[PDB]
Amino acid sequence: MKKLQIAVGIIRNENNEIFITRRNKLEFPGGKIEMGETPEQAVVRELQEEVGITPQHFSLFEKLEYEFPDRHITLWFWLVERWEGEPWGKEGQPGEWMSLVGLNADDFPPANEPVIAKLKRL
């Protein structure tokens, strides 16, 4: 029984647009929390690696858990509202700003559904 945790960054600007990356299907920047890192350190590291920004002000937006045989997975969704730098496709992946109003849960993997609903509201 091992744990696998992933930190996810929801980057929102002043115009209520979120930075979305692509694979085909759309998704949020993010990745695995490594040994010895806190959830906060991991989201900062993964975002610096994937989109070239350093989160400065962020809060826990949602935490989802998945219990599978021999594996406990936790997804940490952080709402990033202020950062240093400009988001871009640093790891060579497609990226772009999309307004919250126009976000469609069907364009993201089913796992993000509850977060999108919550996001696409307030």
* Encoded tokens for 77: 């969704």
Q: How many residues are recorded in the chain?
A: 122
- Closer to Na ion by Cβ: residue 6 or 70: 6
- Look up residue 57 and give its amino acid: H
What's the rounded Cα separation, in Å, for the pair 24 and 56?
30
Closest-CA residue to 9 (of 57, 67, 66, 73): 57
Binding part of the chain for Mn ion, among 9-17, 35-43, 44-52, 113-121 by CB under 5 A, reads: 44-52
Cβ proximity to Na ion, 31 vs 39, nearer residue: 31
| Contact set for Mn ion, span 45-64 (CB under 5 A) | 46
| Using rule CB under 5 A, residue 31 touches Na ion | yes
Total chain residues near Mn ion (CB under 5 A): 3
Identify which of 10, 13, 32 has the alpha carbon closest to the alpha carbon of residue 21: 10
Q: Kindly tell me which of 31 and 89 has the beta carbon lying closer to Na ion.
A: 31
31 binds Mn ion (CB under 5 A): yes
